Design a protein around this ligand. Structure first.
Ligand SMILES: [Mg+2]
Length: 627
């Protein structure tokens, strides 16, 4: 894709949609055929997102929130404490963390999305409508993908839910609620003599867009801050026709302004007609009982604490020449060393460094701003902190946490960690995870994506030479309520006693206790051994650096043909997978054994010959296992 490079983000004519904004080719799991490469798309150290998700919208938005310093630092900062019950918050945490430490390596938003769907479906007020209006937007099935004006609703909902969960952390922070918090006094005047004051702290600000009898974005924001409207809705208390007047007034200027554009197509045409509509930088002040915004501080000097806002980023909708539609995120990040900003454009797994001129241009007929994030100038230059700067709670590794505690069909006795064998950097463990299926792809055009799998069980055993060497310390079955298409019992080894009503075993919740276990281990620096680990991690939705793998599949790989650890065992040991399917601890154990064996054969410097031997013998024998 080089002739016209896929990363070309500019065209000669304004009507032509650049390759960078185009419909990217469908990604798939490492195939098979064939294995997909993301290196042509992303040349930055900033990770893109796997478009293989149902929500469709969120990816862009996710990126938009990834580069808000306060947002990022707080959300990833909450990970140090357990916070199991706050699903969306913590999942957004793990996701942010992963995107940060992947450093350009492709990331998936599958777990966060699964949490979102699990929440929105976790029902049988007026918010319920805003909840169930997402499943109509989720799981596609609605002609062309994007219908106005859902992303704004996604913004409002996400911020709201994150605030609600923020209220119920272990420290009950108001950080996000104080950051996005617009103290909005909305007053309803039933009559001139007598009026009515509702007060709401709103995380985002809706923008229309009517009259305002220069023509850039600032007076829009100003109008949305302080406006007088009338409503047509008749009050039922009389049954008569009631036209009420209502004034909405924003009182404060928070560190982050989240703006949701709800304009007409004609108004968008008026924006594209204008130039520099999206103001890169402005100054605001609270005068009287109104917020006033001007481009420079000299257009109005003001009195008290004049605030400076600079464009952090924005999510925009692109409608291609095909009339297909998709979301794309422009975002800005600060380089303090050179005292200058650099711009990034995110289109799923395509990430490109762009000029500010191109990032601010709104004149393109194929481009339409949807969500806009402004940030306090000083807060925007704060460094993005990592959770590694905090002391973290690893206590979940040393105790039991599950519902409910019936504990039947316990499997082989795994004993827990003690602080004498506390796992620090360099320590090694064996791991195997088994999944179940829930859905199955679509055909889409023939005269559209393989999905979906769900984590069912995960087993981690010790790898350090001790009394309990090779003895499991983790063997958890995952909490999953949703329907299971196929259990893959012959491949997975489920009972299936997966259901919480049918306690069955040590069923444990992946929100995100097991995920927190793995993430803590990886964050500590534990290297993981096993067979076929990449796919496992893709289904756990976690990314481990390759210097902690240690994958027998890769080592014993020859001629690009991946062999079953059943075959490897059977040839080099007693066949355990044949009798009897199926157990994760068994696969992990034999994988550990295989790694140690590989270490032996490597130390003796004879293993290339035994590789060419097991393959000569195999290729000749065509991989048949006696039984
Ligand atoms: Mg396995």
């Amino acid at each position: 894709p080089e002739t016209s490079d896929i990363q070309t983000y500019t065209s000669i004519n304004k009507y032509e949609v650049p390759p960078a904004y185009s419909r990217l080719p469908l990604t798939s799991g490492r195939f098979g055929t064939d294995n997909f490469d993301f290196t042509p798309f992303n040349n930055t150290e900033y990770s893109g997102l796997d478009p293989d998700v149902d929500n469709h919208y969120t990816n862009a938005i996710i990126q938009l929130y990834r580069f808000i310093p306060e947002m990022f630092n707080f959300v990833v900062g909450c990970l140090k404490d357990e916070n199991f019950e706050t699903t969306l918050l913590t999942d957004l945490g793990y996701l942010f963390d992963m995107m940060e430490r992947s450093h350009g390596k492709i990331c998936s938003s599958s777990n966060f999305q699964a949490s979102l769907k699990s929440l929105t479906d976790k029902r049988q007020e007026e918010y319920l409508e805003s909840l169930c209006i997402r499943e109509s937007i989720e799981d596609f099935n609605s002609s062309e993908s994007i219908k106005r004006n859902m992303p704004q609703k996604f913004n409002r909902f996400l911020l709201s839910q994150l605030i609600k969960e923020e209220a119920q952390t272990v420290n009950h922070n108001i950080t996000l609620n104080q950051c996005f918090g617009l103290e909005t006094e909305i007053r309803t005047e039933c009559s001139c003599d007598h009026y009515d004051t509702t007060v709401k702290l709103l995380p985002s600000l809706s923008i229309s867009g009517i009259n305002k009898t220069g023509q850039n974005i600032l007076p829009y924001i100003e109008y949305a801050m302080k406006n007088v409207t009338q409503k047509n809705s008749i009050c039922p208390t009389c049954g008569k026709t009631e036209t009420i007047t209502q004034e909405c007034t924003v009182k404060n200027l928070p560190s982050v302004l989240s703006l949701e554009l709800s304009l007409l197509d004609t108004e968008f045409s008026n924006i594209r007609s204008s130039k520099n509509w999206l103001t890169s930088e402005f100054y605001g002040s609270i005068i009287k009982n109104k917020a006033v915004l001007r481009s420079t501080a000299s257009e109005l000097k003001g009195t008290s604490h004049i605030f400076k806002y600079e464009l952090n980023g924005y999510v925009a909708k692109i409608t291609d020449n095909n009339n297909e539609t998709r979301l794309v995120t422009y975002v800005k990040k600060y380089n303090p060393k050179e005292n200058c900003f650099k711009w990034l454009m995110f289109n799923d797994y395509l990430v490109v460094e762009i000029t500010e001129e191109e990032a601010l241009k709104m004149t393109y007929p194929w481009k339409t701003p949807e969500i806009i994030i402004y940030c306090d100038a000083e807060e925007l230059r704060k460094p993005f902190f990592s959770v590694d700067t905090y002391s973290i709670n690893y206590d979940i590794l040393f105790r039991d946490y599950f519902a409910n505690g019936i504990r039947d069909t316990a499997r082989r006795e795994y004993k827990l960690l003690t602080h004498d064998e506390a796992p620090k950097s360099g320590t090694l463990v064996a791991i195997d995870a088994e999944f179940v299926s829930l859905q199955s792809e679509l055909c889409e055009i023939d005269h559209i994506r393989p999905k979906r799998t769900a984590l069912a069980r995960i087993s981690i055993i010790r790898g350090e030479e001790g009394e309990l060497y090779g003895v499991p310390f983790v063997d958890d079955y995952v909490v999953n309520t949703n329907h299971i298409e196929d259990y893959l019992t012959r491949y997975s080894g489920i009972l299936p006693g997966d259901l919480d009503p049918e306690k069955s075993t040590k069923r444990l919740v992946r929100r995100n206790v097991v995920y927190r276990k793995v993430w803590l281990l990886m964050q500590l620096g534990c290297v993981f051994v096993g067979h076929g680990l990449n796919n496992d991690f893709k289904h756990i939705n976690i990314n481990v650096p390759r210097n902690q793998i240690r994958d027998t599949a890769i080592y014993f790989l020859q001629g690009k043909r991946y062999l079953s650890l059943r075959y490897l065992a059977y040839v080099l040991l007693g066949m355990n997978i044949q009798e009897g399917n199926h157990d994760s601890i068994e696969d992990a154990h034999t994988a550990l054994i295989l790694y140690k064996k590989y270490l032996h054969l490597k130390e003796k410097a004879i293993f290339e010959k035994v590789l060419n031997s097991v393959y000569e013998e195999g290729r000749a024998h065509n991989f048949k296992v006696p039984e």
